[PDB]
Structure 1
Amino acid sequence: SDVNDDVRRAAVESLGFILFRTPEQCPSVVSLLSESYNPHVRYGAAMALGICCAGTGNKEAINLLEPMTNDPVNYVRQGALIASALI
């Protein structure tokens, strides 16, 4: 509902801070939010997928971040590299 990109990032980056205990829910919501129309909703979903799952071989978060790093926009390629290194 909000329109500034900064709060739209910070809301969808907060997914990992609230659901890190259950990793079976973070790829459920990121996989749709990481395919929005703007990059910002796609970007903060990429940081949330990285900070939710700490060090577990997931193979789904890897599968979701692969088109995320395959993007024309430079910073959404960046955080996908950040999230891939974090997982």
Structure 2
Amino acid sequence: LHVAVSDSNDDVRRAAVIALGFVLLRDYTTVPRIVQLLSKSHNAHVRCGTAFALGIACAGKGLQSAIDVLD
């Protein structure tokens, strides 16, 4: 999470967001909050990388909450 802010090359910014989802497969209902700020981030790459993360995290069995963040 610190990484996404700390580098200015925007490939890395994207990557960090994506990667969180795999870490947080236990958690299903914490993930829409962690990336709630990252949809409203101004940088196109942080935004890109939000969609993957939410996707990975709640894959399989739907969740209303996750979809609402992604709209």
TM over 0.5: yes
Structure with the larger RCO, 1 or 2 (CA within 8 Å, 6+ apart): 2
* Normalised TM-score (structure 2): 0.84
Aligned residues: 66
Percentage of pairs with the same residue: 59
Shift of 1:62: 1.1
Task: Report the aligned-residue RMSD.
Answer: 1.0
Unaligned runs of 5+ in 1: 67-87
Q: 1:37 matched to which residue of 2?
A: 42
Secondary structure of the corresponding residue to residue 33 of structure 1: coil
The aligned counterpart of 1:22 is: 27
Q: Is the helix fraction higher in 1 or 2? A: 1
The runs of at least 4 aligned residues of structure 1 exceeding 3 Å deviation read none
If the length of structure 1 is used for normalisation, what is the TM-score? 0.70
- Mind listing any 5+ residue stretches in structure 2 that lack a counterpart? 1-5
